[PDB]
Amino acid sequence: ATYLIGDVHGCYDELIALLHKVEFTPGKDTLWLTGDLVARGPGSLDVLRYVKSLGDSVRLVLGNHDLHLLAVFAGISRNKPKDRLTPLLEAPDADELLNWLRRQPLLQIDEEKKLVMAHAGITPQWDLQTAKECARDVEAVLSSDSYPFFLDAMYGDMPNNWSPELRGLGRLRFITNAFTRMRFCFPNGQLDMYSKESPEEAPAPLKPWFAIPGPVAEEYSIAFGHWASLEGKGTPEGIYALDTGCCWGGTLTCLRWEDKQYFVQPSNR
Numbered sequence: 001a002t003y004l005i006g007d008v009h010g011c012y013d014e015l016i017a018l019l020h021k022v023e024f025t026p027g028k029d030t031l032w033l034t035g036d037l038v039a040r041g042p043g044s045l046d047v048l049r050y051v052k053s054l055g056d057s058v059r060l061v062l063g064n065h066d067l068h069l070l071a072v073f074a075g076i077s078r079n080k081p082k083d084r085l086t087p088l089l090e091a092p093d094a095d096e097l098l099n100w101l102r103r104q105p106l107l108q109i110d111e112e113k114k115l116v117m118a119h120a121g122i123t124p125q126w127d128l129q130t131a132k133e134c135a136r137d138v139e140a141v142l143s144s145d146s147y148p149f150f151l152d153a154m155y156g157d158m159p160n161n162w163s164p165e166l167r168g169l170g171r172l173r174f175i176t177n178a179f180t181r182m183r184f185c186f187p188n189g190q191l192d193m194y195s196k197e198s199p200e201e202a203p204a205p206l207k208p209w210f211a212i213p214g215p216v217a218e219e220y221s222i223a224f225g226h227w228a229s230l231e232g233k234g235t236p237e238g239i240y241a242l243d244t245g246c247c248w249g250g251t252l253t254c255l256r257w258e259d260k261q262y263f264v265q266p267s268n269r
């Protein structure tokens with residue numbers, strides 16, 4: 001069976017309880033995770049240890065909080081007490097866990113399922129070939145010995161409009177924002193980097209990225225997490241918003257792909 005779970009955010013107990021509910025069995029089953037494995041919840045260390053131990057039984061994409069953790073680890077960004085990352089940062093296997101984390105993908109594709117997953121979704125300005133090339137470019141910088149330089153370069157809100165002509169810092173910044181921060185678009189597909197509200201509460205003319213028809217969404221299903229204020233609701237057919245806000249006091253959601261059956265674990269917070 002194939003299971004897809006939204007943002008875990010250190011909610012180790014809820015993750016394990018949800019996997020027991022579906023009798024997840026590595027070697028018979030595969031787990032997809034939308035990213036944001038860490039921060040806010042109490043168990044980021046246990047979450048990373050477990051997810052790494054799954055090997056080929058898990059398909060992860062990196063989220064914005066995963067990248068922030070890497071930036072803190074690398075001395076690029078300051079640790080926020082609210083993120084509850086110190087046990088992970090001080091763990092004896094921190095290097096092993098975080099060097100594994102920075103090598104994980106930004107994008108997962110299964111052609112037999114016609115299924116695409118990224119943390120925030122796929123911007124309507126990208127076709128599949130472009131999304132794959134952009135994922136490969138940022139994965140390359142994150143997997144390299146010089147990854148702290150990129151992590152520092154990644155911060156920024158512009159450019160917010162994709163072009164194949166983009167180069168350098170702006171190209172990397174856009175790619176990072178599209179895969180890990182995107183929620184709303186202007187009518188032309190350009191990214192808004194400020195509104196984090198639900199679609200009904202957003203100021204005009206902003207619309208959810210998935211409300212603008214794009215080439216990837218026309219041919220593939222897209223699963224994503226990230227957008228907690230969406231509450232996993234209000235999406236079109238073929239769009240699966242899996243982040244139901246577990247670390248916020250909401251729920252952890254698991255979707256089984258074969259029958260599109262949902263399983264939900266209440267937050268312990």
Ligand SMILES: [Mn+2]
Pocket residue numbers: 007009036063065226227243
């Ligand atoms: Mn999140």
Ligand SMILES: [Mn+2]
Pocket residue numbers: 036063064065119180225226227
């Ligand atoms: Mn996120």
